[model samples]
Target: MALSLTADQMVSALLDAEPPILYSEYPFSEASMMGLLTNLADRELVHMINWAKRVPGFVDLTLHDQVHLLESAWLEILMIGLVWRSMEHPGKLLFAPNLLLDRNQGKSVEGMVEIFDMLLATSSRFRMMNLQGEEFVCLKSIILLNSGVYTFLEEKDHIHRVLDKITDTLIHLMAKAGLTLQQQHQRLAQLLLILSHIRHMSNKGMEHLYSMVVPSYDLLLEMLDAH
Candidate 1:
């Protein structure tokens, strides 16, 4: 129904605040990055669950379907928030100045090239547009509830319709923010492409997470096995 005004507000409220500025001045080692990423994965999973429970229509979902949506979308939504933090730091991937990496780190990671490319491109778009917090919050809502071909949800069309309405509101927000029609259209399309690339990056992230030398998942494993 008319959930956008409320729905968007709900999403805004649940986002709570900008992620904590856990600044690290020293660079991270492979050991440290893995440890950090494991912890990072754990936190984002909880964050996803928190948002899912509070988003307007999520409470109406069947427990089975709710778990399904989180499993499919959590990592994707995690990257969205990651980009937001990257923007906040301006040119750095992580918010902490000390935990940063050189461009060569990707080459060392083997399969990181493709995923890193997508991430940097998406980050550039966010920076270029100076994407605002409210806008990103709304966009995360769209990503989290998306009813893409999971083939598991009993109410696929029902969720699809929900996403369509939410997306419509996002489009209106863009125009109201003062973009010309052409800019709005282009930006809206580009945002979708960004999400599309995020899906690929999330897949790569999963691969990396699974292959970590010392996997440290409590919440992360729970979410992985959930659906």
Candidate 2:
């Protein structure tokens, strides 16, 4: 039988499966910051995989297609998570619940200063919007489903159908919140604008990753090399 998961249930499952709050106990230095980020990325990657499997309609895609989507969108998903986590901190990035850093502090790591600023900018915008949890999860789902450059998906129609359902869920959320039609339109436009901005940052992030010493995790290397 087909999986009976509803869009709301999918959103709830995504939230429920959030990665545990990570802690970086190492001293903050250039080398340690690099190591901490690598360590955090490795753990988050594992959670990302599990998160995808729990997403409604994700596992319904062909096995190859599933891998392709994850490979294409992992960085963007990471960006979304970063933005969400740091939203409350304003000018600082909460890399982990315990590992917050301001731009000057982030400058310790070579090449990270720009990325840190970009991430903080996005987080600031999210803060201004007062982005809610349900909205964040829906946007993440859209990012994962819509990622990839020129790669052709084996089940494009199915993927688009799933995306449509997610869009409906997002709109339903706005409606439930008593937002007027015009307000809903404006909010959605703003959210989609963030998507393009995220795409730009994700590309920049990939370039930054390329210049860094290789992370120790094989899975991280594979995902980075995928794009």
Candidate 3:
């Protein structure tokens, strides 16, 4: 089966499917903040799972593969979701109308400021590209199905074939919109670079989350450990 939605419809639909509002503008205890972040991660992971299940070719993957990919891809997908809904301010992440934070404000939380910079930079690039929903969904699918971190040797060929199909669809979609081949190539390269940065940022986020000291830190740590 082939991709069936126009880019416009996909973007608008995904815009409505933004991640849950995890934090409001308030003074949260470290314990409270960890809980919210944990909730945020879990909620975003489920959102990605549901979205992936609805994609054209996702459900065919083995259940074990699906679970592994989702666990490993959670943070990257969550980063993309955050970038999608980011505000224009320098270092602000807009989870809700009342929930916005700049660098100084976010720095109080252990790993907040570190990852915020990457998120901000990536979001800026996304805004500059005016990234379309059609491509955004395609990008999410590609990220969700990426299982390299997991030792899934047997399914690697199948995974690459799926990625190739999605890449072809993305290219065809770009061409249909009248982009020159070079422009389409550039767009693909740029998005791929963004994914690389997201990997680094996620590693940093996990490192910080690992060393946190708070009332419910163990639960938060366990949540990260589980994924």
Q: What is the C-alpha lDDT of each candidate?
A: 0.64, 0.79, 0.66
The stretch of ten residues in a row with the least summed lDDT in candidate 2 is: 212-221
What are the per-residue Cα lDDT tens digits for candidate 1 across 122-159?
A: 78778888777667876787777763345463567667
Give the clashing pairs for model 3. Answer: 11-133
What order do candidates take by TM-score, descending?
Answer: 2, 3, 1
Candidate 3 off by > 4 Å: 1-29, 87-90, 147-150, 213-227
lDDT tens digits by residue: candidate 3, 35-154? 666665655554455566655455666666666666666677777767877835556776545666566666767667768787888888888987776787778777877734345555
lDDT of 1 at 193: 69
Off by over 4 Å in 1: 1-27, 88-91, 95-98, 105-110, 147-149, 212-227
Write the residue-wise lDDT of candidate 2 on 1-227 in tens digits.
11355656756776886666667654468887888877888778877877777677777766566677777788899889989999988888888877888999988978878888889999999999989999998899888888852475456777777778877778888898999999998998899899998988988888988874433445544553453
Model 1: lDDT of residue 214: 24
Where does model 2 exceed 4 Å of error? 1-7, 25-27, 213-227
TM-score of candidate 2 to 2 decimals? 0.88
Better of 1 and 2 by TM-score: 2
User: What is the alpha-carbon lDDT for the whole of candidate 2?
Assistant: 0.79
Candidate 3 lDDT (Cα, whole model)?
0.66
